[PDB]
Amino acid sequence: MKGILGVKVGMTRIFRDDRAVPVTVILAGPCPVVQRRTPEKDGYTAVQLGFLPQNPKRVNRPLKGHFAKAGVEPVRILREIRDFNPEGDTVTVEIFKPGERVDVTGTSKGRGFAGVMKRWNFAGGPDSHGAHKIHRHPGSIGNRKTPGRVYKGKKMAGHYGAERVTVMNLEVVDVIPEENLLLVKGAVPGPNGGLVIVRETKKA
Amino acid sequence: AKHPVPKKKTSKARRDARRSHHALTPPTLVPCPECKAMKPPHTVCPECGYYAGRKVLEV
Amino acid sequence: MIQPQTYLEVADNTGARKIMCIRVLKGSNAKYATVGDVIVASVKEAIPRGAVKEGDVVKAVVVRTKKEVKRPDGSAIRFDDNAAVIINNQLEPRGTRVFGPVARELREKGFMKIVSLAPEVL
Amino acid sequence: RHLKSGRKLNRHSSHRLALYRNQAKSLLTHGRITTTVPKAKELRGFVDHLIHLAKRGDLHARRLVLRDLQDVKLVRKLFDEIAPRYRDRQGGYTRVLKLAERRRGDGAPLALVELVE
Amino acid sequence: MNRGALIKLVESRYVRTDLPEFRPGDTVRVSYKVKEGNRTRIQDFEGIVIRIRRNGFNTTFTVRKVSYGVGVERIFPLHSPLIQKIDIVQRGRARRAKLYFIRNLSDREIRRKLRADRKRIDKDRAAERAAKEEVQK
RNA sequence: ACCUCGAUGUCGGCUCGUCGCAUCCUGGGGCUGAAGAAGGUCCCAAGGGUUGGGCUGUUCGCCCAUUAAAGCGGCACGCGAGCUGGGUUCAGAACGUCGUGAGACAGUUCGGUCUCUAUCCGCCACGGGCGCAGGAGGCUUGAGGGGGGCUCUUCCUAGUACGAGAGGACCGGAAGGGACGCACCUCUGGUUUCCCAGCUGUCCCUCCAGGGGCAUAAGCUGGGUAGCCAUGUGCGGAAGGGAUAACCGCUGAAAGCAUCUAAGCGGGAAGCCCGCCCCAAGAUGAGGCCUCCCACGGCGUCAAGCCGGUAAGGACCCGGGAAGACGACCCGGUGGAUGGGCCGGGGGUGUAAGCGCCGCGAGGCGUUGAGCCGACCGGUCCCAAUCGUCCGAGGUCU
Ligand SMILES: [Mg+2]
Ligand SMILES: [Mg+2]
Ligand SMILES: [Mg+2]
Ligand SMILES: [Mg+2]
Ligand SMILES: [Mg+2]
Ligand SMILES: [Mg+2]
Ligand SMILES: [Mg+2]
Ligand SMILES: [Mg+2]
Ligand SMILES: [Mg+2]
Ligand SMILES: [Mg+2]
Structure with missing residues (x-):
């Protein structure tokens, strides 16, 4: 399963043949190979990718050792992607031709403590009467006495947001090898500037 | 005299185990650049002043 | 967007002039009906001695909407009313003339005979 | 939830806006001023804006300082006495320093807002 | 990173500029491409511009036209790749930004609220014609 | 009639579901008085879904318009420490009927007070301690769990099979809808509490001009960035893999014939399980990987620890956030753009004040698309995170 690391900048629209396609734009280029996962020593195949360079102004953590063990340069944060064994170098969006379908995984906008309506689209009740x-x-x-208790999984008031929300089957419009960009069908989660990871769509 | 209601007089441990989360964090503090005084972070001590913003008291 | 109990106008010489929807003909448990859709209405107001008199149970196609129309070319279009043309199981309109602009949307739906007699298509 | 834009507040609108208007008077009349941290953290901005308009030379500005300060002898002071001391300064026209003490019967934190000099 | 909004602009190669200028409070016509069933037409659509929603590229404007006794409004995007020609016809004084009252109060009473902003007329009438001599020499 | 005479409040509706299957629709199969489609009948199967109204207190029912269907039943006829008083069998009053009566009615009509403080279990969310055989940073696997599964219409094959016409297909493929679900702001469309302007009355600054207060907890009105949302947008159900239910066969004996079963094999449903998405090592079974740190100063006479300064790291404090009820999570802390100020872009409101020209005038015209400015996108050390404090290992046994 392919994979690439991006960040959200927003969304507008292009035009195609004679119609307006709502898109969303993402910076996903400079993702370098870091540590891979061997089915022999780790138990599977998966490639660590970091993104967003950052001058070492606190990274004195052992993470500094992680980047020297692969000639990498200090990135902001760094995540994995399974079933993706490319070439030990730098992977860019140029593997995404204007046609493929994608599966984006980003963060959810945090909507604080939630009301049961808002949270599960109930109806609350009347305005009157x-x-x-x-x-x-x-x-x-x-x-009442039977069963006497309250079920589990009962939709009740709580917390909506800040979860991993994967969306599926967005199609790439164009791609930019000059400034390293990716565009898809628009509705991508996350605030305009946050964690968001992209990979091939589960299908055939 | 109203609505929900305790059923059984809450026992001692019962009453007391709730109250572990109630003990006070003691105040954190630093010493004044000049004074030999003890003083909060990002503050101006009630005796000295500073070096870009007075406080200077009196006798 | 047209829901039950919604006085539409009448855009053809069928006779009627104001009708209220009963149900949308777009599915089982369906909500609204933009243009290009067929509804069941009850003629609640109609010219004397027409072809559809008051208190009838008609089938009419909606060609207007005070709601907008996100045409997929980005563009949008809206009117200041809601208006239908009364048709039949045979779909072909029952009046001999239509007045008022009719959305392009209808022409795609095989309602050619109306955009044919359209005075202006938008 | 809220707070995805940005603000600090308490009590209703008029009271809030008039409070921002009373401090400026209580500021430009003294300099060293001691209120509460959040009341101060929002008072820096409402001041510098006015200060910055006063650095400008335009009676337009005055009536825009008069819009919040209903007393000329409180603003003719601001112009030909305060604004020059901040020429050649692209901003910053207000210092704010956390105090240390905290009043009795309130337990609220305190801070100082002296016009930077 | 610090280009977060330049990115969209970079994505704006679909940008035109032969559009002439205008502002809410005047009439104009466009010319548009519609899948005319079998083919495509240049649907000249003349009306009053009502609202202007600006946002750089995806800036939209709404045109209203009273056709055959029906108050219509029409919303178009500025950089729409469907505008062949587009030429103003008249200009008028604004006094307010939007004007959601020509909806309710559409009549001659708008032939007196519009009024001819003759200022921009001379402006339009200036570079339109007096600058033609700044081409033919 | 055993339970409740120190309340079992006796029908529905609002929301909220859950389960059952004797199934309403979709699916699989047999027989058919099954040409074809269509229908009837029964065998398997809860996966999903099962509309909106009219009538009265009603659930029940008839009806309207649709529809793939508008299923029945349990859960105290589910649900007043959630709502509803609507009626019901209080005190008032009147109609009918019984007694001469006082009153009465398992007859009727009108009106008629539903208890802020959740102690324990339960549940939805979020935290602190501890543990995870040394400690810390980051990245993952998936035992375990949860969520969704729906469905119509059209069309090619082909008006071919079938039938004498009308009608009219199985298998496959394509396109379009309805609802439901997850996310989003670009457009559409709402808000946005002082972002901008207009207006009245009054009282003030200072008389004119210009401006402020009050008329909401905005005085009213017109427009509205960001942000949050639906009417708007994108996507999803699926494809696919295996084993099965009803049913269909192959081989073949007991039983020199037959048989799907008794040894054995295949096909087979939206249903079972993988595949899809989400939590997840408190998975005391507490995982796996990369990296960084490293002894004992002295007591406890042998012990498990103790009274102190450290490492890698962390917290505290601060500035803060599309994060958030506290707490928690994440960015920044002078090597920095975290907040405020300021600059510019976007945007919003729409020609500021002043002056001049014109008009006996309210006013208009040029300076003018001027003036003002909250979030958006970036920039700039001007003010502020300055200074520092605290915690924390010194690696059990065969
Ligand atoms: Mg409501
Ligand atoms: Mg025509
Ligand atoms: Mg705030
Ligand atoms: Mg108060
Ligand atoms: Mg007020
Ligand atoms: Mg026969
Ligand atoms: Mg089922
Ligand atoms: Mg909007
Ligand atoms: Mg009040
Ligand atoms: Mg869908």
């Missing part, structure tokens, strides 16, 4: 104190309340969680 009675009680007032139930305009966005849950409304009934159980039965």
